[PDB]
Structure formats: C-alpha cells, structure tokens
Design a protein around this nucleic acid. Structure first.
Lengths: 178, 394
RNA sequence: GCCGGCUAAGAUCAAGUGUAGUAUCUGUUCUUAUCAGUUUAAUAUCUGAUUCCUCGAGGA
C-alpha cells in the first residue's frame, strides 16, 4: 500500500572486513539512532552473521524519512576503506555524602566480620538512592566517618536526606554533603 | 451451604473444635454496645482475622492470631472481650481487672486503651489509664476507682503486683489474657516479665495472642502458656500447593486457543498435560481441535460414557494420549503421576476449583507447572487468585 | 474542545524515576460550613473559637 516515505536504506558494495561500529558511525552521519529494542539492525550474512562475513548488503533505519532521502542523495557510492558502496531504497532485497556516628573502632577489634557486613549494608543502602561510584569507610576514625561518592549530586542529596536522623546499629548516624 | 467459601477466602485455621467464622458483626454473638461501637466506627464488613478470632474468643478457648499490619487485631481482641464482659457481667472487685492486655510499648498500650475506650463508648465501663515512665500515684488512683481491662506495660504490671496495687485472685478475677505483639513479648528481653505475669494468674482464664509476625521458636514458647490453642493466619485452609508453580496470563477468549496452540507447539506443554475447561461441549470442541491439529488428545467429561472416560484416563496414565481435556469434576480427587502440566484455559467461578486444578499436578513433594489464562470476565476471581498466589508464594 | 453545561479551568499531601539544572509519573483530599488574627493588589494560606425527624439503626 505505502509506496514513498520509506525508512529502510539498503547499502550495497560493502567489504566483508567491515564491522558494526563502522556501520553505526556511517549511519550516524545522516541519523541519530534506531535502537528501538536494544540497537539497530545490521547486515544479514549466511549463518545469521556468525559464519559468513556479509552477503554484500546492509540495512539501515532512521527516525525520519527526509534524513534517509538526504543520505541516499548524498552518500551514494560512498567510499569506505575497502571500496565504493551504493545506496538504494528497496532494491528488491529485504556529589559526595559524609556519614558519621555509624560505627566504632572498638567493635571491629573483637569482630573481624562486622566491618565488612557494615560496609555491605552501607553499600546496599547507598545503591537504592543512586549509582554509587565510590564508597569508603574509615575504620580508624573515632567518629565513624564514611564517604559515599555517587555520579549525581541529587542522589547524594537524597541519600543525605534519607540517612539523617536514621538509626544504624543502635546509634543515631548523621549525614552531610561534601 | 457456602461455609467452605469463607474458609477458602484464605485463612489458615489449625486446632480441634474450631467454630465457624461469622459473616457479619450483627450475627457474631456480640452485645449491643459492641455493635453500637462498630456502627459508629464505620465498619461495614469485618476483617477475616477478626471473623476467625471473634468466635474463638466468644467460645472461651485460647486463640493465637497472625495477620498483616493494620488488619484490626486490636478491635478483634477488644470486641469479643467486651461482648463477653457485657453478656456475662461479674462483680467489680477491688484491685482486680477482668482482662489483662500486655503491650511492649507505652504508646502501643495507650493506643490499645484508646481502642478499648472507643469500643466501650456510651457505657460506664472504663478499663484503664496507666503507662510506664509516668506518675504511679495517678495510675493507682485511676485503678482504685474500678478497672475492667488492664492494658499496660509488663514492667508497670510487675511494679503494681510487687506493691500490691494490682493482682489476680485465685477463684475468679480475670477471664481473658490478651497479648498484643506477642513476638516481642516471647523474646529474650521480655521473657521473665511475661513469665511472672502468666504465673500469677487465674487457672480458669483464656489466653489471647496477636502479632504481625510469628517465628517457630516464639510460637513454641507461646503455645506452652495456653491450653489447647487455636491458630489463625493466612493462608493454609483450601490454599494452593507451594511446590507447583502457578502462572497467570492476561489473554482474550478467542486468543486462549492460540495461546494453548503456541504452548503446545513451541513449548513442551503438549505431552503429559491436563487441560481444564468450563463446559463439556467446550471440552469436546477443544479435544476435537487438538485432534485435528495432528496431536493425540483425549477427553473426559460428563457428556461422555463412563467406559470412554476410563479408557481416556488409562490412555493418559499409560502415555497413549499426550493431552487430556477434563471438566471441573476431574480436577479434585484425581491423583495421576503423568499429569505434570495443568493448563486452565477457562477460569472457574470458585477459587476451590482452581486450587484443586493447581494441586492436581505436582503432588507428594514433586514439582509441577500450572498455567492459567485470565480473562476480563473473571474479575471477581482475580482477588482470590492474587490471594492464592500470595499464600503460595508465587 | 462540543452543542450556559457536561467537574480535563486551579491549589495541595505521600511515594517512585532521573538530571549539572529544569523536571516526569501514580495514588489522595479539596474546605460544600461560620467568626477573629496574619497575609495576599484581591483570593488563597495559615494561626484559634464555635436537640429534632424517619424506620436498636440512619440523617440533620
């Protein structure tokens, strides 16, 4: 039924020594991305692109039809490292939070597994607020200093708001920004 | 005739001589003041834990109830006790309460006292006003004027028993012993206080315990203080088997046959499977559609003869028939070792038939697979299916 | 938007997701009421006070 406004571009004349990153880079010249389920399509080889290299054809999709038309009108017979390639429409092919009053050095003297369990509990508490990039616990500090560095300061502010006034191990721990 | 539907609602009941659950508060054997408080509070339908605990407390036996948070355990402990106090009135003796409620916290004891005052509204019965960490003279002056129930801390109760301010007489003092949050009272912290509270009590007195969670050791410690207890939780009575995996998919009525053909074609659900249907004619049509699709299938329903149904059962047991279509009569009582998969394409109106269909496959500790197709017409059974999945852990 | 209305015209509470930042989504309530003070361009908001009828129950 539909004749024009096609988003499927067929690139022919591609060397078998090509990869998918190069195809993505070439498609990005005229588009943005077509990674709907996970990513965008690629060339279809003999054994599902597992045994063979490529069956002299590759498929490319774009968000709009004007971009595909401009690519077909401009990228016609584009020269890649192996050879020149043609483009067709169909072709009849297919931020640091500081926590204090959380632990004590006297509890880790007679319990070597309490510090690792407290660190795992602090990591599990910090993982619910955001992506924790770095987490350290000072076992030699008398105030129980701990540092949680995340990728975003909003997650660190949310962790400092959720950790201030909360109880951990029978002691009231405090949280502040850095 | 619908007494089994109240037990299937999902309320594990354990014990000998258990009374039937009441449907409403108007026919539960309560007094006029408890019904007036329930009408003033705005309770249109009672809780299932309350409907399981109120006849057990009205009969005079020991009960141990476990439910979720905010289910109304305080009202379920206060309403039949006040109903038994109003129906069977006794002489208000000096320094002796008729009920003893144990709370691990002072705020929880104050909330229990407020709930007991709201349940005993528009009446002359004032239970208690006492808490820990306050003045003992005001509590002694409040308890000296008359105390129906005793809802306070175990430490304050031990201090009142040591100073001869409140105790339990031997002949007739108290008839009900309530224990709110019994998981904390049966712990190592509150063990000797609860032991001294339970030791100095009347012999002829009921013991009630209610908590949100209950471990095995805490239940074994609490069962020794009671005499023939009745357990009440969720869910066990008429519940699904935990060994059989239950799966619910949202499909249409016409897409159910396509989903069954995709499960028989792509997946390994065609051989050694039992398919439950709604009617006998629909089961015969499904068996004819399975036989027309190059698949050996047998059928057993009320429209067929007994010899043909016995031959179909023998072919399903021996392995001659890959799939066996059956009605709701063959869902319960059938014990076949070859039935590994249970495909419920038609959802029944009652949850007991679905529980019998889920329990027919994967019995005696073995694993099993149960796949049921949920449609838009079975909206009333969706809550029962969700309760069965929450009780079975699916 | 449709032929004055059908409560998609506003404010506000709890939780989730996420950013450098703005934000996005789900579930409420909305005083149906009066007076005094604060305040607002004006609202708003907040701060306090405020027996009868019917068939054991409901409403005012």
């Amino acid at each position: 039924v539909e004749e024009d406004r096609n988003t499927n571009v067929y690139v022919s004349g591609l060397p078998p020594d090509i990869t998918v990153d190069e195809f993505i880079q070439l498609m990005s010249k005229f588009g943005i991305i077509m990674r709907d389920p996970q990513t965008e399509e690629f060339k279809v080889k003999l054994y599902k692109d597992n045994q063979g290299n490529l069956k002299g054809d590759g498929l490319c999709c774009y968000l709009k039809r004007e971009s595909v038309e401009l690519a077909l009108k401009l990228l016609d017979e584009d020269e890649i490292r192996g050879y020149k390639l043609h483009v067709e429409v169909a072709k009849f092919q297919l931020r640091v939070v500081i926590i204090k009053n959380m632990f004590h050095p006297m509890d880790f003297e007679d319990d070597p597994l309490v510090l690792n369990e407290i660190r795992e509990d602090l990591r599990v508490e910090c993982s619910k607020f955001g992506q924790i990039r770095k987490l350290l616990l000072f076992d030699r500090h008398p105030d129980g200093v701990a540092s949680v560095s995340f990728r975003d300061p909003e997650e660190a502010d949310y962790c400092i708001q959720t950790l201030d006034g909360r109880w951990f191990g029978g002691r009231q721990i405090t949280a502040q920004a850095w | 005739v619908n007494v089994f539907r109240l037990e299937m609602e999902g309320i594990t009941v354990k014990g000998k001589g258990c009374p039937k659950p009441i449907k409403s508060w108007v026919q539960c054997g309560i007094s006029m003041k408890i019904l007036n408080s329930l009408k003033k509070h705005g309770y249109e339908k009672p809780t299932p834990i309350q409907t399981q605990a109120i006849p057990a407390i009205m009969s005079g036996r020991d009960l141990i109830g476990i439910a979720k948070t905010g289910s109304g355990k305080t009202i379920a402990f206060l309403l039949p006790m006040f109903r038994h106090i109003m129906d069977q009135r006794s002489l208000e003796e000096g320094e002796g309460p008729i009920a003893v409620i144990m709370t691990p916290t002072r705020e929880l004891a104050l909330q229990i006292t407020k709930e007991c005052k709201k349940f005993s509204k528009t009446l002359g019965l004032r239970v208690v006003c006492v808490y820990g960490g306050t003045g003992i003279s005001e509590q002694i002056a409040e308890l000296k004027r008359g105390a129906e129930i005793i809802v306070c801390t175990p430490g304050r109760m031990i201090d009142m028993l040591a100073a001869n301010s409140g105790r339990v007489t031997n002949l007739r003092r108290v008839t009900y012993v309530v224990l709110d949050e019994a998981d904390r009272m049966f712990d190592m912290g509150f063990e000797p206080q609860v032991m001294r509270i339970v030791d100095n009590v009347r012999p002829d007195r009921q013991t009630v315990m209610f908590s949100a969670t209950f471990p095995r050791a805490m239940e074994a410690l609490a069962r020794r203080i009671l005499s023939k207890p009745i357990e009440v939780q969720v869910g066990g009575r008429s519940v699904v088997c935990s060994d059989v995996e239950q799966q619910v998919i949202v499909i249409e009525e016409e897409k159910k046959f396509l989903k069954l053909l995709e499960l028989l074609g792509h997946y390994q659900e065609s051989g050694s499977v039992i398919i439950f249907v709604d009617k006998q004619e629909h089961a015969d049509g499904l068996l004819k559609d399975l036989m027309r699709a190059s698949y050996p299938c047998m059928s057993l329903h009320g429209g067929i003869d007994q010899y043909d149904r016995d031959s179909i059962i023998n072919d399903f047991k021996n392995g001659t028939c890959k799939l066996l279509v059956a009605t709701s009569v063959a869902a319960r009582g059938l014990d076949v070792k070859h039935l590994i998969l249970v495909v419920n394409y038609s959802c029944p109106n009652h949850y007991e038939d679905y529980v019998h269909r889920a329990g027919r496959t994967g019995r005696a500790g073995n694993k099993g697979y149960a796949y049921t197709f949920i449609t838009e017409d079975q909206a009333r059974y969706a809550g029962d299916i969700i309760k069965a999945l929450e009780l079975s852990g699916t």
